[PDB]
Each structure stands twice: as structure tokens, then as C-alpha cells.
Design an enzyme around this catalytic site. Structure first.
Site, short mmCIF file in Angstrom:
data_model
loop_
_atom_site.label_atom_id
_atom_site.label_comp_id
_atom_site.label_asym_id
_atom_site.label_seq_id
_atom_site.Cartn_x
_atom_site.Cartn_y
_atom_site.Cartn_z
N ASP A 196 29.34 -14.20 -46.05
CA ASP A 196 28.42 -14.04 -44.94
C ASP A 196 28.81 -12.96 -44.18
O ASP A 196 29.47 -12.43 -43.32
CB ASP A 196 29.17 -15.22 -43.90
CG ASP A 196 28.26 -15.34 -42.66
OD1 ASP A 196 27.11 -14.80 -42.48
OD2 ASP A 196 28.79 -16.02 -41.72
N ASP A 243 21.86 -10.66 -43.41
CA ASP A 243 22.74 -11.92 -43.12
C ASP A 243 22.68 -12.88 -44.31
O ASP A 243 21.63 -13.73 -44.57
CB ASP A 243 22.34 -12.62 -41.77
CG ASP A 243 23.29 -13.56 -41.46
OD1 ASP A 243 24.34 -13.93 -42.07
OD2 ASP A 243 23.19 -14.28 -40.69
C1 LIG Z 1 32.57 -16.91 -36.26
O1 LIG Z 1 31.77 -18.00 -36.02
C2 LIG Z 1 30.67 -18.03 -37.06
C3 LIG Z 1 30.74 -17.54 -38.26
C4 LIG Z 1 29.64 -17.83 -39.11
C5 LIG Z 1 28.45 -18.60 -38.78
C6 LIG Z 1 27.23 -18.50 -39.73
C7 LIG Z 1 27.38 -20.08 -40.52
C8 LIG Z 1 28.41 -21.11 -40.43
C9 LIG Z 1 28.51 -22.27 -41.27
C10 LIG Z 1 27.28 -22.18 -42.15
C11 LIG Z 1 26.42 -21.53 -42.46
C12 LIG Z 1 25.51 -21.46 -43.49
C13 LIG Z 1 24.69 -22.54 -43.60
C14 LIG Z 1 23.80 -22.74 -44.74
C15 LIG Z 1 23.47 -21.63 -45.32
N1 LIG Z 1 24.19 -20.52 -45.08
C16 LIG Z 1 25.18 -20.38 -44.27
C17 LIG Z 1 26.41 -20.23 -41.36
N2 LIG Z 1 27.22 -17.55 -40.48
C18 LIG Z 1 26.01 -17.22 -40.22
N3 LIG Z 1 25.52 -15.81 -40.59
N4 LIG Z 1 25.28 -17.82 -39.43
C19 LIG Z 1 23.88 -17.33 -38.81
C20 LIG Z 1 25.86 -18.76 -38.95
O2 LIG Z 1 25.48 -19.55 -38.17
C21 LIG Z 1 28.56 -18.91 -37.48
C22 LIG Z 1 29.57 -18.70 -36.29
C23 LIG Z 1 29.45 -19.35 -35.05
#
Ligand SMILES: COc1ccc([C@]2(c3cccc(-c4cccnc4)c3)N=C(N)N(C)C2=O)cc1C
Length: 367
Positions: free
Chosen positions: A35, A223
Site C-alpha cells: 500500500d 496509491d
Molecule cells: C493507517 O490506516 C490506513 C491504512 C491503509 C488504508 C487503505 C486500505 C485499507 C484496507 C483495505 C484497502 C484496500 C481494499 C481494496 C483494494 N486495495 C486496498 C485499503 N489503503 C489505502 N491506500 N487506502 C485508500 C485505504 O483506505 C486505510 C487506512 C485508514
């Protein structure tokens, strides 16, 4: 060598790309979302209906409690600690990294995604609970001799269950076998997200003709943790309008354009040629220069032959997500504060492209 990192990514279409990691001693195997849109190493650390396994600090001889919690509503919450972390199909090193052991969460984990945590590869400024919590990659770089750079080749599916996708995360360098042609670089405007500047957008060669501040309102980021190309309202609307017109010969329900419903053609009949190419021009390393990345309908229509429109509206700026990255080899050159794009090694009339330079200013949406 980078060869052992090739194809180290797996996932299900729309559910992110994950890399196998281990945490603790003995190693606990977990699949971890790659991520670039966040900065915490956050791992499921308690039973959850969507988790088939999780990090058990009690099973780890090398776990160290930081005696500090983290709460991230947006939700997930956890307990901060450090432990030994490895990427089996990554660099042959082990680092002591911060780990947010997720003890409770809501709509965070994804049913069937096959991953149990997230590897946030962005910068400390956006780490939770604050920038004092060193991100994994910072720790990796500080503790090892791994070069301060990584690159992602996301390959998607290509032609009952969500399509399996694959890709490679190359940590510490650039694998030339993963791309063709030239790598073009756009500056990292600021080290928090991987923030970039888009200076022009075209649909089938037609300029959207917007003030470029609009493309970056209020920021543009790269992202891997976002599936779609997400665009600021004004830009999304102009884009959809243009795409609709280009594909006018075939009209679809507005539910499809909204990213809700799927459009279907029976195996092998999808009229790709009806959908336009999209070109994002990114600020060049040199002031009055730009370059473009051009993506095909095969990228922005994602399979679920049924497809969903993978371009969607954003109120937090442009997000160049997985479907955008899937055309390309993307180099996160942290050392030189820049992001490179090249055509990835992974129809017969069109191809994704990366091309420059093109002539132009003040496109950044200050902060
Ligand atoms: C520290 O906290 C975090 C960390 C990561 C994320 C997420 C996240 C979290 C869980 C699942 C995904 C996800 C789902 C489907 C496809 N691909 C990523 C993304 N990763 C990003 N880039 N995004 C925009 C997010 O919403 C969100 C939070 C709040």
C-alpha cells in the site's frame, strides 16, 4: 537479486495486491497488502471473521511492547510494538519494525482478499498515530543496506471467483525486465503521500482544457492501495462526459458509469475499440516539461465477460490507483524524491504508453 522478487505479489481483482511476509519468531506467515497510500505496518492480531490467520504476539519471542495504542477511524485500532519482520520473496533481510497489532476493526479487512495486514509504504508524515512512528520502509532502509527505492509492477488479470491478479514488488531497485521503453519521472511534490502533479488530461487525444490546478485539487497521489483511478469531481465529470461520447455507439446504464453495475458481453466480444484511451500528463523533472501515461479501456474496465467502470469520483484529490498502475512499471524513487513510469512488460490496435516530453506552471494546490 531482483529475480526472486518477481511475481511476489498476488491478489484478487479489486482486493489489492499482497506480498507474503513473516512477523515474529518463529516466523508467522501472513499475506500483507502492498500500500503506497499509507504509512503503517498494520497487521491483524486478533481473530476476525475475514481472517483465517493472524499475528500472535504471544507466540513471538522477539515481540517488544511499546505500551502505546493506536486508533484509526476513517476503522481499526491496535497496540504498538516492534518485532522482527521479513519478506520471504523480498530482500534477504530481517528488520525490527513497528507493528500495529490490530485488535479490533470495522470494515477494514476484506472478505476473501487473502491478506491479513497492510504494509504502508508512504512517509512518516501520515503515519498513525503520528510522524514519530517510523514506517516500515524507513526502518528497512535505516537498518539494512537496501537502497531507498522500490518499484511496483501490477499486472492485473488479463485473458465463479474474482480473477486472480499478480505482480512484483521490487524492493531496493529497478528490474529492467519488468518494463519497456523509457522511464519518465515526475517529482514527489512533498513526502507524505506519494504526491505528484498532473498538468494535463486527454481522452482520445482531446484535451480536457482545465486549469491544471483542478487535476491536483487538492492533491494527486499514486496509491497501490486504491483500486480505481479516482478524480476530483470537476475532472471526473469532464472525463466521464468524454468517455461516454467516445463510446456513444454503445450506450450503457448510468449505474455503470457510477462504478456500481457491470456491463457484459459474452466471452470474447467486448468492443474495446469503442472506448477511448486516457492520457495523464505529469509534471516533468524540468519546469516547463511534462510527459504522458496513456491507459487503455482494458485498464479502466476491470473484470468481475463482465466489467466494472474503474474510474470514480474523489473529494480528496486524484488517486492514481491500481488500474492506472497496471499499465506500467512504477518506480517509487524516494532517494531522488520522484516517481518514474514506464510501459510494463505485463490488443492489436492500441497499447498503454509512456511518452515525453510535451510542453507545459502553478498546477500544485498549495498546503
Ligand atoms: C493507517 O490506516 C490506513 C491504512 C491503509 C488504508 C487503505 C486500505 C485499507 C484496507 C483495505 C484497502 C484496500 C481494499 C481494496 C483494494 N486495495 C486496498 C485499503 N489503503 C489505502 N491506500 N487506502 C485508500 C485505504 O483506505 C486505510 C487506512 C485508514
Amino acid at each position: 537479486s531482483f529475480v526472486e522478487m518477481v511475481d511476489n505479489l498476488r491478489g484478487k481483482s479489486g482486493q489489492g495486491y499482497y506480498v507474503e511476509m513473516t512477523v515474529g519468531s518463529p516466523p508467522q506467515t501472513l499475506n500483507i497488502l502492498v500500500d503506497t497510500g499509507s504509512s503503517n505496518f498494520a497487521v491483524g492480531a486478533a481473530p476476525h471473521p475475514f481472517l483465517h490467520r493472524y499475528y500472535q504476539r504471544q507466540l513471538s519471542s522477539t515481540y517488544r511492547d511499546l505500551r502505546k495504542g493506536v486508533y484509526v477511524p476513517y476503522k481499526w485500532e491496535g497496540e504498538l510494538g516492534t518485532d522482527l519482520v521479513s519478506i520471504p520473496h523480498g530482500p534477504n533481510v530481517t528488520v525490527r519494525a513497528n507493528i500495529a497489532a490490530i485488535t479490533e476493526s470495522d470494515k477494514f479487512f476484506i472478505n476473501g482478499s487473502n491478506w491479513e495486514g497492510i504494509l504502508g509504504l508512504a512517509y512518516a508524515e501520515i503515519a498513525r498515530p503520528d510522524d514519530s512512528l517510523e514506517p516500515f520502509f524507513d526502518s528497512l532502509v535505516k537498518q539494512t543496506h537496501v537502497p531507498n527505492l522500490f518499484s511496483l509492477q501490477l499486472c492485473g488479470a488479463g485473458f465463479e471467483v474474482l480473477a486472480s491478479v499478480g505482480g512484483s514488488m521490487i524492493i531496493g531497485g529497478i528490474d529492467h525486465s519488468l518494463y519497456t521503453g523509457s522511464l519518465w519521472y515526475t517529482p514527489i511534490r512533498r513526502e507524505w503521500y506519494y504526491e505528484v502533479i498532473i498538468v494535463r488530461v486527454e481522452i482520445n487525444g482531446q484535451d480536457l482544457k482545465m486549469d491544471c490546478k483542478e487535476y491536483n485539487y487538492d492533491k494527486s497521489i499514486v496509491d497501490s492501495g486504491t483500486t480505481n483511478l479516482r478524480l476530483p469531481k470537476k475532472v471526473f465529470e469532464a472525463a466521464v462526459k468524454s468517455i461516454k461520447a467516445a463510446s456513444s455507439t454503445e450506450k450503457f446504464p448510468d449505474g455503470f458509469w457510477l462504478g456500481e453495475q457491470l456491463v457484459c458481453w459474452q466471452a470474447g466480444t467486448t468492443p474495446w475499440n469503442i472506448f477511448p484511451v486516457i492520457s495523464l500528463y505529469l509534471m516533468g523533472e524540468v519546469t516547463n516539461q511534462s510527459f504522458r501515461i496513456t491507459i487503455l479501456p482494458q485498464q479502466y474496465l476491470r473484470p468481475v465477460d463482465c466489467y466494472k467502470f474503474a474510474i470514480s469520483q474523489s473529494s480528496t484529490g486524484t488517486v492514481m490507483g491500481a488500474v492506472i498502475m497496471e499499465g506500467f512499471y512504477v518506480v517509487f524513487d524516494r532517494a531522488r524524491k520522484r516517481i518514474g513510469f514506464a510501459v510494463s512488460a505485463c490488443d492489436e490496435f492500441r497499447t498503454a504508453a509512456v511518452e515525453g516530453p510535451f510542453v507545459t506552471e502553478d498546477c500544485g494546490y498549495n498546503i
